Amino acid sequence: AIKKGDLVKVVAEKLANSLEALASDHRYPPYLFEGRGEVVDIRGDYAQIKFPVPTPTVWLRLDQLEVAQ
Amino acid sequence: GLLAGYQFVKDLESAGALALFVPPEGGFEGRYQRRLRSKGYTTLPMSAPGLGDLAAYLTQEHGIRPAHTGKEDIRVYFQPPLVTYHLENLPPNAKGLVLWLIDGKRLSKQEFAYLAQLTQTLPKFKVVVEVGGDRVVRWEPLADWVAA
Amino acid sequence: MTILPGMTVKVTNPNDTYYQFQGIVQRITDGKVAVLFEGGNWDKLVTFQASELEPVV
Amino acid sequence: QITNYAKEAVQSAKYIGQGLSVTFDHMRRRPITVQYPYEKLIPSERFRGRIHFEFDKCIACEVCVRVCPINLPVVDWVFNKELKKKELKHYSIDFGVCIFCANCVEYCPTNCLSVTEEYELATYDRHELNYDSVAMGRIPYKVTQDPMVTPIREFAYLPAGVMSGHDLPAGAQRAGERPEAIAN
Amino acid sequence: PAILNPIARPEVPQELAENIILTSLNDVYDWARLSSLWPLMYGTACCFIEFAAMIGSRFDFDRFGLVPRNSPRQADLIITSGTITMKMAPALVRLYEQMPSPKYVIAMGACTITGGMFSSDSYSAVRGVDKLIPVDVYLPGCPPRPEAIMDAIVKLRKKIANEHINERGNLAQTHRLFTAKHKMKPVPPILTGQYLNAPSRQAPPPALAAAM
Amino acid sequence: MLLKSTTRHVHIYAGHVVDGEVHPDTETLTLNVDPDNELEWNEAALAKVEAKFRELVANAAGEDLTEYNLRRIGSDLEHFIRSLLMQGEIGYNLNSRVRNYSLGIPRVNHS
Amino acid sequence: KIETRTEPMVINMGPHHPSMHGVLRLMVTLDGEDVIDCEPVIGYLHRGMEKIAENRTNIMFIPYVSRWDYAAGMFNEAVTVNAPEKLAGIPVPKRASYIRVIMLELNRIANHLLWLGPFLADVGAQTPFFYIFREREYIYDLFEAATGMRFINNNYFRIGGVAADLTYGWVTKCRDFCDYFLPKVDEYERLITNNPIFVRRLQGVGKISREEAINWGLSGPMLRASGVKWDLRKVDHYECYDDFDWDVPVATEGDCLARYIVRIQEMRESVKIIRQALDGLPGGPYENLEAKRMLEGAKSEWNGFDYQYIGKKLSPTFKIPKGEHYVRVESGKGELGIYLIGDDNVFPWRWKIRPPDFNNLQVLPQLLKGMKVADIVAILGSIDVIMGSVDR
Amino acid sequence: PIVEAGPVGRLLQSQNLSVESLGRDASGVEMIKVDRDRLLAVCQTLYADGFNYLRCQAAYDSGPGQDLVSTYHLIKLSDNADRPPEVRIKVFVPRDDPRVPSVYWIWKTADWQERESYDMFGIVYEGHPNLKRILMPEDWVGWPLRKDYITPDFYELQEAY
Numbered sequence A: 001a002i003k004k005g006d007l008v009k010v011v012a013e014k015l016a017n018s019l020e021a022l023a024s025d026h027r028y029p030p031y032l033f034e035g036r037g038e039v040v041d042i043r044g045d046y047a048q049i050k051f052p053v054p055t056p057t058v059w060l061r062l063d064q065l066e067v068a069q
Numbered sequence B: 001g002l003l004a005g006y007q008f009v010k011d012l013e014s015a016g017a018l019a020l021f022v023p024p025e026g027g028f029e030g031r032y033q034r035r036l037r038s039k040g041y042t043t044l045p046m047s048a049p050g051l052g053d054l055a056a057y058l059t060q061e062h063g064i065r066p067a068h069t070g071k072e073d074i075r076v077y078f079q080p081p082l083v084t085y086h087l088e089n090l091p092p093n094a095k096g097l098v099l100w101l102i103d104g105k106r107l108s109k110q111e112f113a114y115l116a117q118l119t120q121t122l123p124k125f126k127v128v129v130e131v132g133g134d135r136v137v138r139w140e141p142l143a144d145w146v147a148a
Numbered sequence C: 001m002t003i004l005p006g007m008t009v010k011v012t013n014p015n016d017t018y019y020q021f022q023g024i025v026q027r028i029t030d031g032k033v034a035v036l037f038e039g040g041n042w043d044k045l046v047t048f049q050a051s052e053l054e055p056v057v
Numbered sequence D: 001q002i003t004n005y006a007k008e009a010v011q012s013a014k015y016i017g018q019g020l021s022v023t024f025d026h027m028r029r030r031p032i033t034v035q036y037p038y039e040k041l042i043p044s045e046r047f048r049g050r051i052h053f054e055f056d057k058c059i060a061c062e063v064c065v066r067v068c069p070i071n072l073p074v075v076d077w078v079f080n081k082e083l084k085k086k087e088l089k090h091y092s093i094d095f096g097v098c099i100f101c102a103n104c105v106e107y108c109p110t111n112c113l114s115v116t117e118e119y120e121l122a123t124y125d126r127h128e129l130n131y132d133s134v135a136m137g138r139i140p141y142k143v144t145q146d147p148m149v150t151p152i153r154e155f156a157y158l159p160a161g162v163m164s165g166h167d168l169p170a171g172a173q174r175a176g177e178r179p180e181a182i183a184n
Numbered sequence E: 001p002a003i004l005n006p007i008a009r010p011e012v013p014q015e016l017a018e019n020i021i022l023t024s025l026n027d028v029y030d031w032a033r034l035s036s037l038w039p040l041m042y043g044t045a046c047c048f049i050e051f052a053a054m055i056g057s058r059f060d061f062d063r064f065g066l067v068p069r070n071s072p073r074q075a076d077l078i079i080t081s082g083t084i085t086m087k088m089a090p091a092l093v094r095l096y097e098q099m100p101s102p103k104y105v106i107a108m109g110a111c112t113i114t115g116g117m118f119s120s121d122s123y124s125a126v127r128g129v130d131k132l133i134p135v136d137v138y139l140p141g142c143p144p145r146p147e148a149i150m151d152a153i154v155k156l157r158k159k160i161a162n163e164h165i166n167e168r169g170n171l172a173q174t175h176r177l178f179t180a181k182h183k184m185k186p187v188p189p190i191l192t193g194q195y196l197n198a199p200s201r202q203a204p205p206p207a208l209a210a211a212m
Numbered sequence F: 001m002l003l004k005s006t007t008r009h010v011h012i013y014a015g016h017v018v019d020g021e022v023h024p025d026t027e028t029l030t031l032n033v034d035p036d037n038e039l040e041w042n043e044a045a046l047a048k049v050e051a052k053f054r055e056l057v058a059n060a061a062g063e064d065l066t067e068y069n070l071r072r073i074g075s076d077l078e079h080f081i082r083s084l085l086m087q088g089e090i091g092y093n094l095n096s097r098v099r100n101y102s103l104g105i106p107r108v109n110h111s
Numbered sequence G: 001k002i003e004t005r006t007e008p009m010v011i012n013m014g015p016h017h018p019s020m021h022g023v024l025r026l027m028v029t030l031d032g033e034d035v036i037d038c039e040p041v042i043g044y045l046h047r048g049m050e051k052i053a054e055n056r057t058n059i060m061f062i063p064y065v066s067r068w069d070y071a072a073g074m075f076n077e078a079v080t081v082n083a084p085e086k087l088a089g090i091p092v093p094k095r096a097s098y099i100r101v102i103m104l105e106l107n108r109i110a111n112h113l114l115w116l117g118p119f120l121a122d123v124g125a126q127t128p129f130f131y132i133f134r135e136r137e138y139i140y141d142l143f144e145a146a147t148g149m150r151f152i153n154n155n156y157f158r159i160g161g162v163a164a165d166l167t168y169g170w171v172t173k174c175r176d177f178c179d180y181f182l183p184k185v186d187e188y189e190r191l192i193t194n195n196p197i198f199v200r201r202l203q204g205v206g207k208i209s210r211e212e213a214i215n216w217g218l219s220g221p222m223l224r225a226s227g228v229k230w231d232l233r234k235v236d237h238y239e240c241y242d243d244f245d246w247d248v249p250v251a252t253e254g255d256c257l258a259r260y261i262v263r264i265q266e267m268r269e270s271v272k273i274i275r276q277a278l279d280g281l282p283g284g285p286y287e288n289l290e291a292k293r294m295l296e297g298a299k300s301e302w303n304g305f306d307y308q309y310i311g312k313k314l315s316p317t318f319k320i321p322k323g324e325h326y327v328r329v330e331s332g333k334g335e336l337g338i339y340l341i342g343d344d345n346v347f348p349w350r351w352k353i354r355p356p357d358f359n360n361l362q363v364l365p366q367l368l369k370g371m372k373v374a375d376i377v378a379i380l381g382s383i384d385v386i387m388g389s390v391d392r
Numbered sequence H: 001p002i003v004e005a006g007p008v009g010r011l012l013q014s015q016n017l018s019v020e021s022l023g024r025d026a027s028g029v030e031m032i033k034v035d036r037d038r039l040l041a042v043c044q045t046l047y048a049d050g051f052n053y054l055r056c057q058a059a060y061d062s063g064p065g066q067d068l069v070s071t072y073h074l075i076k077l078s079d080n081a082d083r084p085p086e087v088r089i090k091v092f093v094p095r096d097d098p099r100v101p102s103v104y105w106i107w108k109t110a111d112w113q114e115r116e117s118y119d120m121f122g123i124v125y126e127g128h129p130n131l132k133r134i135l136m137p138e139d140w141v142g143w144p145l146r147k148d149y150i151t152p153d154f155y156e157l158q159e160a161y
């Protein structure tokens, strides 16, 4: 459903249970939930998200992502 | 010479658009924007290559596009017009402001003359464009410097 | 001769770092002309004093 | 004993005697130094000073963004469907963010972007370095066309044999560009 | 609102009246600071070699009056020559507070202005030294030429002469202290001063040397 | 040890200050906003960052007392002072010797 | 306040560290005059270089790489462009290969000269520190002519070869430089071998055996100064370095005096490789290469796949092919390797820089065992460290 | 099987240490998969064989949510060689429980290199002396260079505004 190149937002409930929560901090930064990250290079079940903050991009699951219209 | 008075402030009220010729090792230009700042004139030292079109920067608002750096959209930051935003914050009990442009020697003559004819059409505002170099710091109006 | 913005000139004076380099001029001004030299990898334009630039056909 | 301190002192007090002589002979040589604001040293033919810009040449294709290491140059363009050709409306390279690697002047088809020779850009404000398209299109400052600077040349530009740029009355580079066109 | 990040109107009149005598003493006050200011021998990344090439013989450091000091107290100028990460970010403020108040930090290189090439995607780089300490003169370049640093010294020297002797009060820090009590668990420090004499380097532990 | 979080506008130390000399404590955190006078404050917004400083200290009072966690509090205060500039509550100081505009330039709202 | 106790005193070298080899922090503890332990705190220049490359194309990452070993410069660009050109099988022309040997041997001279100046001031005499940097300024202008920058940020190495050919008065200007610098190499050697006060600070001070050097992991003039004779330009047949005759400088002593004489002998052998490459150049000088381009421009022995600076000027959208890789380049400081594994897109999947100084700094606690306090910067100045390579 | 062995894989087969031999490299070295329980048995045989020099102990992520890899590119160093035999041992480890046994006692070059594998990636090395963070602050909590590392909203890490 989630294409390559549309604005997505991260859901907090499906993120802090899985394997993607071990790499990061538990206190999640607020730029994930403001829906502005452009998803590029979907690879199977996972997706790289270019968030508007000048930090490295993250790879999250496509189940952990909600489209921000 | 060495003991400088306040003739630099009186020449700026006369001409309105000066053109300093300072020593290129610096340190001797700024002693004349202290005599300028002692007489109530505030000072906005800007950089002459950093300005774009001086009409669209000084008296008009300009859309400054910041570095999106590949992780941001094309934002347009509309900054206020520089000489007429620093005039309104300047209180009316003090005198005007001066534009202390440094590295004026990379400005074209069309941008020299635009800074010359603006200081009289805009009240309580002057410019000092630091252009060129000389062994002794000296000034002249911008009206005949473009006539050189 | 006069210089229009886009003709191929080459430098003629010997007291200069760019002795005989040639290229397209760009953004002629009231006393100065910048000549894009087309040199190798990174194209470089250098200011001159509107003289010592003999063009070729 | 007493017959040793007149012989254990000579072995190095004459070595500093042959060391005070060589350091005094270091003062015999001319000071090879580039006094900056009165002798600015001439940059090379490939030096990446700062980027120039031609607003009448940039056809809005963002190759400069895709080859930049940080995707720095802001290309503001509309599509302009009445003419069916994209025409830009603003261009800016925020220097200070700009590493002067000049990938944009290399991968450009229309030869718009180009490196200048001026390194003398230093502002009091970080945002005064965000150059406009008409601020980048200004004419560079040449070291030779300044009546306060005696421009001394660089190494690999002197004639063959001399390794200094001060007592150089004339000359050129140590080779010829086209010497062999009527020879061979 | 009306204007984002506004400029506060200076309500003070700045009655900066002075005679011929006091400004003649202010010229000597500013000349003595612009003409013999001592930079700290500081350098982190690549811009320290371009700064150390200016110490040498081809470009003269001690020609404007610049003497490099390897101590924060004796130096006033600090040329931030190098990319500062999350580490060196508390260390550079500590080098900055241990200075007499005419400081005049100048940023050198692209990575002390906006964190230049690591401003796109880097998890530990502070983007610009002006997120930690106030900067007088900015200097782009990567790396700047040693001639280009001596312009930034010249641009700095023009800024010392603008400083006034009766405006010496804003050079000291203001102290708006606030206090809150927390309930965070204190942690023992990670980096204790033993490396070789730690009780894990002398021999491999059991339940791991059996399969060796 | 003096765990500290020193950005430009926020100096959070792990301890209390007795007349300049900072003494490292375990219970308290001291904060002085804007050591350099870059922003001209007022009585209203200085209490507004106290509605943010004591909020984040009470929120993060279940975590560890490290330099990483003091930096997380000192960052969110520095993101709160920048929100006070974009709301036009405080403004830039012009009596300061530097005018480098660390928290963005002045700009008008909606062109 | 400060008290006087009887336990061993721990001093912090501090991240300030007024030296020219980066920003270290040694928590070295003292036993009166002898050290007993020392932990190095690194990471003060960790800008996240490996995470950057996973969002960079190769032409977008070529400016990033000459900041790890910023004394060297193009030694970092050597490993970078060799990672997809040895994986995609892209042929490098023979002339562009010899320009790479010319540029890398000039970087190793500049790598060793930046090592030499601070090392001579740390071991004693401070007056050659100003005369060595003058000799490095000649190497700056040789790169400033050919590339557009002095010692780093010189995007010269490409995937299909090199960025551009040399300038006109360039090949005759090593013959002014590297025929003048080579008399001064023996002048730098006679500073420490003669005046026998410097040998009492370098004989046996920081000695490492041969068997411990291979186990702890060492490369370049720190491994070879224990009597190993391992050089990756000889071991790996790397880009027409095998077309020259040059001896590998070995010193079977292990001490810091052996590390001094090897690095001085690496300067001397580099000029040998330079002069064999300036005369062994395929088209010779560029002003004479371009001369044959006009007399026989249709189809000659010149204008081939060789005698030119690039094979094919590749697009910015050059996809790295799929496969693991590990390319090695013998730098001036050791083995600088990168472990490239890339997917079929333009970004590599993992870019693990294996630095030459990250693996040589882990021996510094073991070398500082029994050494004195005045011989701490004498050890650290002889590892030839650049922090930025260690921390990335 | 599907993929044949090589010169190092046939040596480990002759010592009753079954290893999942991968194919050749893109440069031409042997890639060998060893489980984390049989790592110290394999590397003790290769060190006695002659592989006295380990380089680039590289932790590598196979993708987000996949198994982490700790690679060991060990070469046979001699006094003078001409392309000596090398082999890369890759040890796959899951995201949860990322433990690989340390090879510091075999090769001392895996002290800081395994710290860099623990500083960036979450791979905890059992038996490793002084296993801490080198490249980062020691009180950092996240694991960068993983594909999943969400960088915190620090004021210093933002744009210059």
Ligand code: SF4
Pocket (backbone or CB within 6 Å): D057, D058, D059, D060, D061, D062, D063, D064, D065, D075, D104, D107, D108, D109, D110, D111, D112, D113
């Ligand atoms: S690289 Fe050249 S053609 Fe492409 S957008 Fe920039 S100026 Fe235009």
Ligand code: SF4
Pocket (backbone or CB within 6 Å): D051, D064, D067, D068, D069, D070, D072, D073, D093, D097, D098, D099, D100, D101, D102, D103, D104, D105
């Ligand atoms: S100089 Fe570098 S950063 Fe600047 S526009 Fe060119 S490629 Fe981009």
Ligand code: SF4
Pocket (backbone or CB within 6 Å): D099, E045, E046, E047, E081, E082, E083, E108, E109, E110, E111, E112, E116, E117, E141, E142, E143, E144, G067
């Ligand atoms: S921009 Fe480049 S040269 Fe300047 S400090 Fe950063 S890494 Fe060094």
